[PDB]
Structure 1
Amino acid sequence: KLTIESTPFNVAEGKEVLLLVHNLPQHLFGYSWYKGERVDGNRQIIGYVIGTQQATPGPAYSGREIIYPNASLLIQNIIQNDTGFYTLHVIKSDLVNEEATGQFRVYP
């Protein structure tokens, strides 16, 4: 089952956080990252397209986020309003969709 894990779970106020994915389906088409617990258009951070090797930012892009080809996310220079949930949307080659959710908190 598609799972998201965070390293580290407890993050400092100036370090970075890495979100990694386990059980990634094969034969994909693209994937995107969201802010929250639902696939909302206004709260999208970054997306990737495999067929053309393309990465495009979204409406919620502060400039501190990096995507990776293995569908992993890096967020650097954490501030106090970046704590909560993130949602991953995966598109398969047969146009069917899947979703997953991850969580972390920020402490001073």
Structure 2
Amino acid sequence: EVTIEAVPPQVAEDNNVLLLVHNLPLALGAFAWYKGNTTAIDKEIARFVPNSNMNFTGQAYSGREIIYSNGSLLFQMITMKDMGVYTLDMTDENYRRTQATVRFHVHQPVTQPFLQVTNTTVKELDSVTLTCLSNDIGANIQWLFNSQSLQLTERMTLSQNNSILRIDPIKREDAGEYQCEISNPVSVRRSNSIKLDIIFDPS
């Protein structure tokens, strides 16, 4: 049947996207590409017609959009505002089918963070608290230890959406360099490399 995929699904700001239309049934009278599920002329961006090949547009922006004979739509410079679901409708008088559910996501390229730790020098069974400073909201922070995934365990505690990380009680094992990392869908940027070394109080 009708399959509509968006390449790339998960788009990036000031980057392009295509509204793929797989197996688009028998050569209809024409197709229509709408925004937002509203099967209303209120939002018609494009209507291509088989039987007499021709491009007529609707009351839709068309500042950067294109419909195709395979019945598909590329979308240039998408923006947070362009985010959301889109719908295509097709018709051949005998029948008009809508079934064009297709949503994708836009993304703000990430920025570099920066840890802040108070006292690289700490005692066994004391506290530490890496905090991954970032100004970007819509986060996926990840904590790295010695350039690999911090296993995250019982004596650790982290909140404010993975921002603040607090290890306690600390133990020599923690003798290493910690780094915080921000994700978006894979448009990432790692933090500095606060090294933390340990001294223990008793002997």
TM-score (ref. length: structure 1) = 0.91
Q: Which residue of 1 aligns with 2:74?
A: 74
Q: Which residue of 2 aligns with 1:57?
A: 57
- Deviation of 1:26 after TM superposition, in Å, equals 1.1
Q: CA RMSD in A?
A: 1.2
Aligned partners of 2:21 and 2:72 also within 8 Å: yes
CA distance in 1, matches of 2:23, 2:51: 21
**Partner AA of 2:41 in structure 1:** G
After superposition, residues 1-108 of structure 1 pair within 5 angstroms as 1-92=1-92, 94-99=93-98, 100-108=100-108
TM-score (ref. length: structure 2) = 0.50
CA distance in 2, matches of 1:62, 1:25: 25
CA distance in 2, matches of 1:62, 1:91: 22
Structure 1 stretches lacking a partner, 5+ long: none
Tell which has more relative contact order, 1 or 2 (C-alpha 8 A, sep 6+).
Answer: 1
> What stretches of structure 1 move > 3 A for 4+ residues in a row?
none
CA distance in 1, matches of 2:62, 2:33: 14
Bigger share in strand: 1
- Deviation of 1:62 after TM superposition, in Å, equals 3.8
CA distance in 1, matches of 2:80, 2:36: 16
Aligned partners of 2:33 and 2:86 also within 8 Å: yes
User: How far does the alpha carbon of each residue in 1:56-89 deviate from its partner, in whole angstroms, 9 at most, with x for none?
Assistant: 1111224101111110100101122000000010
| Other structure's SS at 2:42 match | helix
Matched positions, count: 107
CA distance in 1, matches of 2:70, 2:27: 13
CA distance in 2, matches of 1:38, 1:82: 15
CA distance in 1, matches of 2:101, 2:52: 26
Aligned partners of 2:35 and 2:86 also within 8 Å: yes
CA distance in 1, matches of 2:22, 2:97: 13
Aligned partners of 1:45 and 1:58 also within 8 Å: yes
User: How far does the alpha carbon of each residue in 1:24-60 deviate from its partner, in whole angstroms, 9 at most, with x for none?
Assistant: 1113110010011131111111111112211111112
- Deviation of 1:18 after TM superposition, in Å, equals 0.5
